[PDB]
């Protein structure tokens, strides 16, 4: 449960970063 | 008075910072180049 609670915020921050990376990948 | 007046609501969110002075010194050299300020701050916004 603690690992899932940390992985939620980690996946949120990495999802923001991966959304930026996916926008850059769709751009080029 | 000056509580909700738009000039100085957000002046000191972080400790200090004065609302007035420009952050980069290259702006100071560029002001000195053409000979030229809080009136411009109240006109355009707080940096």
């Amino acid at each position: 449960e603690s690992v899932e609670d940390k992985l939620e915020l980690r996946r949120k921050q990495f999802h923001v970063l991966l959304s930026t990376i996916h926008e850059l990948q769709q751009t080029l | 008075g000056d509580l909700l007046s738009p000039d100085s609501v957000l002046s000191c969110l972080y400790p200090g910072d004065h609302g007035k002075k420009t952050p980069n010194p290259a702006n100071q050299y560029q002001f000195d180049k053409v000979g030229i300020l809080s009136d411009y701050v109240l006109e355009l916004g707080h940096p």
Partner: protein, 87 residues
């Protein structure tokens, strides 16, 4: 008048040569950008981690602010709205 039209036509030829130089160099720059993008893609885990047309014309600090503002509005707090005002 024929002097003015001849000189303005020479100026338009020079401007067309400049537009072609801009375009050639611009095309080369675009090609370089594409290569950079490809390199970035290669560098690019990702599976676990997994408005625009107006933001096409923003300044780069404004573009970073717009991306971070939409990310914070969709991520944690929905009581936030952004808009792009200008010409």
């Amino acid at each position: 008048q024929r002097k003015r039209l001849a000189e303005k036509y020479r100026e338009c030829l020079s401007n067309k040569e400049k537009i072609l130089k801009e375009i050639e160099v611009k095309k080369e720059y675009l090609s370089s950008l594409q290569p950079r993008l490809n390199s970035i893609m290669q560098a690019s885990v990702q599976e676990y981690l997994f408005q625009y047309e107006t933001a096409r014309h923003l300044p780069p600090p404004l573009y970073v602010l717009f991306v971070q503002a939409t990310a914070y509005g969709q991520a944690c707090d929905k009581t936030l709205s952004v808009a792009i005002e200008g010409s």
